[PDB]
Symmetry: D2
Subunit: 303 residues, 4 copies
């Protein structure tokens, strides 16, 4: 039986004795927080722990709150150098509720971490019998157990009776193929997100610029478009060296280059299919390597 390590971070999730049939499980509590309070320190702790302990185990399961699981998963997807299975899991219903989903979710997460075919696919999220890549995976519904979906490119595999039929793998570079190495970092660059909508205030953008943030992600309208006062603030900030990534509040589809915004004129980067919170993760890691907008665009084209 493979050796699988469970790293607990919190969320609503031996209670699952069927685990004994598929792995030798050992658990460590890393932190114990609601994922709404997830932060850079937890990310840095987790990446360092997995990278340090990679040769001690045959794979990892991280138990985590569902609210920001999609952000942690992408961060680990870029910063983990262990190419053994690394699987995130949570639960949409409390462990004491009727038809609690956590027990099966955990079993399936361990199935995935124990499958040697899971290796080399990047950091995964396993939820509702489905194996999802950490890049595209997002919470689509506030309450449904089936909430996690890879909304642009689809899942990697489906789990039936403890087996995975894998039909896909992510093409974008991940894990040991990225340049991001947080082994010596105790902090990450400051990156904030501003929302666009009718009559949008420029005060949020201005507050982040006044505080000297390293980067700002715009949750734009449509294809990453900006309310004019937000555009003005971010254009000024980019000329003073703030990195600016245009993403979109729209829940599927890319924010493209060569659409309505002249990104080369303003020094802006287009996020592609990365939603605002995922775009933040990649921007904060890009800013550990470069402040140059063309190099940041290349990073957003490859990772």
């Amino acid at each position: 039986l493979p050796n699988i390590t469970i790293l607990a971070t919190g969320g609503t999730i031996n209670a699952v004795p069927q685990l004994k049939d598929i792995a030798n499980v050992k658990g460590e509590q890393v932190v114990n927080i609601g994922s709404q309070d997830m932060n850079d320190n937890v990310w840095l702790t987790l990446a360092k722990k997995i990278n340090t302990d990679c040769d001690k185990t045959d794979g990892f399961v991280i138990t985590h709150g569902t609210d920001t699981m999609e952000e942690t998963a992408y961060f680990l997807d870029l910063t983990v150098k262990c190419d053994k299975p690394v699987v995130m899991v949570g639960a949409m219903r409390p462990s004491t509720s009727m038809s609690a989903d956590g027990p099966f979710n955990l079993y399936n997460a361990v199935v995935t971490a124990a499958d040697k075919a899971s290796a080399n696919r990047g950091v995964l999220v396993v939820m509702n019998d489905t194996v999802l890549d950490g890049r595209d995976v997002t919470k689509t519904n506030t309450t449904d157990v089936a909430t996690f979906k890879s909304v642009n490119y689809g899942p990697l595999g489906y789990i039936h009776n403890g087996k995975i039929d894998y039909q896909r793998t992510p093409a974008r570079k991940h894990t040991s193929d990225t340049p991001f190495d947080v082994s010596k970092l105790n902090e990450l660059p400051k990156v904030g997100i501003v929302y666009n909508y009718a009559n949008a205030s420029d005060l949020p953008a201005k507050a982040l610029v006044d505080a000297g943030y390293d980067g700002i992600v715009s949750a734009g309208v449509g294809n990453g478009n900006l309310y004019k006062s937000v555009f003005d603030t971010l254009a000024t900030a980019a000329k003073t060296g703030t990195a600016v990534v245009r993403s979109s509040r729209v829940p599927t589809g890319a924010t493209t280059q060569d659409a309505e915004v002249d990104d080369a004129k303003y020094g802006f980067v287009a996020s592609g299919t990365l939603n605002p919170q995922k775009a933040r993760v990649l921007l904060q890691l890009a800013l550990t390597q470069t402040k140059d907008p063309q190099q940041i665009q290349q990073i957003f084209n490859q990772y």
Copy 2:
């Protein structure tokens, strides 16, 4: 043939407009007028107030309205009009996802189908509508789901009202939430709306955006929460102060479908917060701005978020 007015606001898609789609002559007598000409990314309160007053004043001059609009904020304008318009004739918004000069431009047929919808007497009394990709969507639930797809507009929580086939609608649904002439919102004498901003939640979220809106004395803040309207700790701290110091706080969600419910992780009664239900952040802003024309009381604003 019904009289249909086109009110143009901007976006990809009025004798220029009418003449591009001569088939409109088969289904309506079309007239209309350019109200403003802006990209919808720059849509604002002044345009909303102009449009609502124009529709309400002109209601008896026509049998129905089509508003041509940019797609990026169509869903916001639609909900504003759905709450403020007192004309119960068909009011239909329409845009285009591809430029009118592009191969397989969607504008022409979208406009045709919008006039079909505005010309159908069965469209009356269903609130303000969005007609896109052969589908009739209610102004409350309709949202842009995809950055580029022609099929982007969906009613992601409760579904469409009707589908259009060969110029006919089969209506199977109508919105239960009160709209148009059944709301108390009356903007006929307003030149400005209450100031409502939106803040995003994510890992390590800054409190600076929320603090900036409190410092400026905003009437309201809508939170684009994580999951079921949950707040990053530092944003919670700021919004807790806001709600006790004269700024209404609505918890919505960045998550694209499903309700932000009462009786979940946040004790809204203790903080003086309101839960948005299925209204996404930008839609929640629309109703909060209109609620604040009537009341500053959080229990009354919650009642408004449970009825409209």
Copy 3:
């Protein structure tokens, strides 16, 4: 607390298994039949409709426990034939009751919540699955294994359930229950209606077999917008002019089979199914054929119910 009757049919003492039911209703259960829903049949339908119609004034609402494979068919049949306008809610489970994170317990709880809600009345027969209230006409099984499989794929759900409360935002506009003319109170059998599939190189032999057997009706699971393979079109065009009702439906999982597209139904004596998928179109055609054999009247029925 409302009185709720659970009518068991099969699929995957319930106050003991789900003790929380005691907090929301007074439940009594009766076993009507015990079958896998892959074996659902006209006789079970007729028994259920008569039982609900007879028992309507003895309870405040019904939950029917049912296999998920044909729940969408039974639900529509009941939606057309039940004359009780008290809540009638069907429920199943996609995971075995002994499996990890079994869905049946909470599904049944939510079904009783829905049947106990006065707001559920007058909405027709419902399906409650995965925290969602779905109308019996549009509701369909979209996925072979997912707990979230049941969706109203054309017009969407009526309401969502959170903490035992429903926020209803929609009701079906099509006539149902006490607003239909269908009355099965005296019937022990239904008109014979079969389904044939269309695909590249499709055999005409299935269609021919049902005509040779004297079926009252045939539903076509057409390609695209209810289109028919040439040899199937030949068989059904003859059948429609020689005493067999023919409904064009679609194997395509969403959208209508429309009037006024490629197939001129008026001229062939065919009926277009609209959004009804083949198995749902069969339900309405069997019930239409209890009233009329006229293609124009059957089309009107497919336009109203």
Copy 4:
């Protein structure tokens, strides 16, 4: 500029109609057949595969124009039988070419973009619709009328087209094209494979008619996870004991028909289709039956292709 061949088969969809084609490729066309895809058939399939295989070295890529109704079937057939590793892209239109906002022109443009992109080579036969690149195996028509109808409903698209560029992020893992054992170079006919539908009260007459005609194979559009109405099960179990190949697929539009569920396939000699829907399972079963009649070897083929 690449040389691209358009092979026309019929459906709603010339460098004259879409002059922007001249910017991206040197296009030449040939009419192979001119039929509505509802009438698609084995003879057209054999003609197309042998034409692409014969003509592979004369061009840099192929676009096949086809009706939308059975495009998903032709695409998978070609995906299994084409040995040309150059781009092979199928395309259609959901609106007539003379209608307002006709989608054919841009669809054709994007199909040629895809066929011209060297990164399209080695992905198997593709469908390009609504600015999306779809693999031939998973692609299906999900809506009767929507221009956005074509989706890869289980595993998602391979890439998206923006301003004439493709961002490819996925590729099919199942073996296709020059990696399959199927070779139709010398066939003038395909094994006879029919499809029967399951529903409540299903007739066994369709299944019996196909067995009486000596069909090589029968695909079942099962309920739920490939389940069978009792009388259909009985007919197909009898047929499989006399050598008829039997594939269990599902009428349910997404998800696998799995091994190890309610049906003991090994005991009956049945094959589970996995994610292949009934019409797709027919394609693979017809081609499997050119190699083997053995149920275990047919199952292995359904596990690999």
